[PDB]
Structures are given as structure tokens and as C-alpha cells.
């Protein structure tokens, strides 16, 4: 949990009366009780990497022990350890001094993969 804050707008389900002693001269209006926390992925390290190392399907958890029915294979991958977003800056003009109106900022992200497989022929 990085930071905490509350939502703006009307509370759809207000705090029960039994749980708060009403005030207060001032205040009197119960603050927004809709709390959400910002996440944070913390440290990314090479020791925590799951990829760039081979996996051998010695035994499968299910009954299908690695048989690619229909001659197809679905490989799902999620990798947030390489989520760095590159910032590009292109100049529209070059004024005598530095002016923000002369540049456009862009967001770009890239993903590089190399899928390697080793299959075994089987007869039925």
C-alpha cells in the first residue's frame, strides 16, 4: 500500500449511526468514507525472474500430460517487470529561448519475446 485517499462524491451507503458519535458544532457532515489505496510493485530484480530459463514438463497436474490436441498450443504470459514506458519528445520549432510550446511529448512502450519449444512425437 503506497498511499491512501478517499473518493469525492456522495456516499451511497453511509456509515451506520451506531458506529459514529455525531458532531461537532462544525463538521456535522460525515467525511467521505470510501477509502482506496494506491498499489506499488516494489522492487523488481533478476533473482525474481521467471523467464529466460527453461521449463521441462515432467509431470502435469491434470490428466492431459502435455498433449497438444488439434496441433495447437496456448501459451499465456504476463510480465510487469519490463513495463518501463519510454518518453519521446519531438520539436515543432526551436525558439531563441526554451518554450514548452515548441515540443510534443509522447508515450511509447515495447515488448520483446522469443518463444522456444521442444516437442515429442507420440502415436495413438
Amino acid at each position, epitope marked *: 500500500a503506497r498511499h491512501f485517499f478517499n473518493r469525492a462524491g456522495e456516499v451511497g451507503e453511509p456509515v451506520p449511526d451506531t458506529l459514529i458519535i455525531k458532531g461537532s458544532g462544525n463538521r456535522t457532515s460525515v467525511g467521505s468514507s470510501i477509502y482506496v489505496n494506491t498499489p506499488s510493485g516494489s522492487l523488481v530484480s533478476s533473482e525474481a525472474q521467471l523467464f529466460n530459463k527453461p521449463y521441462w514438463l515432467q509431470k502435469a497436474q491434470g490428466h492431459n500430460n502435455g498433449i497438444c490436441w488439434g496441433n495447437q498450443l496456448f501459451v499465456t504470459v504476463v510480465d510487469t517487470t519490463r513495463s518501463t514506458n519510454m518518453t519521446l519528445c519531438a520539436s515543432v520549432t526551436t525558439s531563441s529561448t526554451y518554450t514548452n*510550446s515548441d515540443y510534443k511529448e509522447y508515450m511509447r512502450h515495447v515488448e520483446e519475446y522469443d518463444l522456444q519449444f521442444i516437442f515429442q512425437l507420440c502415436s495413438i
Partner: antibody
Amino acid sequence: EVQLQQSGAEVVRSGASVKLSCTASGFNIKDYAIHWVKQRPEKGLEWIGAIDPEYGDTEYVPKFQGKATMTADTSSNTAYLQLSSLTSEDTAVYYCNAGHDYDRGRFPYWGQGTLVTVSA
Amino acid sequence: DIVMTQSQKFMSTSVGDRVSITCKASQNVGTAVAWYQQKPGQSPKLMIYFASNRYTGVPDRFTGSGSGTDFTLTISNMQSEDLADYFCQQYSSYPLTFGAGTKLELKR
């Protein structure tokens, strides 16, 4: 190659509406902040409002609120300025200006100018 | 409503001389001031924006200066093509306002 073409001069009787158009300012993904300026031979230049294509945001002047209505067509096009109950004080030349990409202050790209005459 | 007050409506000078046009603000606007040039029968052309930055186009002959509430446009050595109206504009807060007209005439 960055010029703005407008609707053209129009002679209108009092009590009728007129619609002015602009061109080549207001595209998808780009982005511009379009402004309109009124030029009265006595009051000089008067800012009307600021409209942003790709969002359709609208800001006006309390003097012109209820007098000037602003619209933006995201395809092509943009920027339509229409005035309702036209009086003798609306006889002026109206300009469609766009600072490059964004912002207020900058009007480096002006329209050709449209002379509106409200009289009988 | 920030009022833009320009000193003189007309201004005299001669070819080659140095001219300075003043623009006084009714409020502090930092450096959010722009200058425009308008010739008769034409649409205004942007000259200086952000107080002292020349727009793509405008020769080093034109120089802007000032901050807060006093702003000035200076034309170091003149040409015949510089005879036009000059406006100052405030864009610190809405509504945007302009100054009164200023006609530059030659003493030739």
C-alpha cells in the same frame, strides 16, 4: 500551408441568427485550442471564447454568454460560431484563431476574417 | 477583468529610429502577455508571445520586455513595412483582454 478559411460576409436583418464557420482547425488526435475574436471599429479586439476540438470543451465571456454559441465537428472541419438576436452592436469582423496545438495567448494562425453587418 | 491600457493611440517616429510601445496591466500577469501586428485590410499577425519570445517569422528587429504589470515592445531601427497597428494581450486569467489600438506613423 496553415491558413483558415471562414464562411464569408453576410448581411442580416435585426432579430435573425447567423452562423459562421471555420476550416482546417480541429482534427482528431490534434488537439488545437480554437479562439474567436470580435473586431468592432470602436472597441478594438474582444475575445469571445475558447473551444477545444477532440474534447469539445467550451469557455465563454460573461459579456457574450447567451449571445454567442460555439460548436465543433470532430470530423473535418470546425469551428462554428453562431449569434442569436443580432443587434447593431454585433456589426463587426469575426476571426477564427488557433494557437498551434494548444494555449490561449498564442494566435499565430488567424482566419481570413468575416464581416457581419446587422442592419435593415 | 484585467484592463489593458496602452499609452498613446498614435505614435510618431522616422525611418531608422527606435520606437517603444508601452502596455500597462491592471493586475499582475507575470509574463503572460502577447503582442500582435495588424495592417489595414488584413488579419493580425502574432509577433511576440510570453512577454519576450519572438514567434517563428518575426525578425530580431522586434524585442519584447517587461513583467508583472508593465510591458514594452521595442522596434530597433525601422522599415516602411512596420507601419501598422500594435496590440498587447493578457492571458493570465479569463476573460482574455486586449489593449487599445496604437498607430505607428513615419516622420519622413
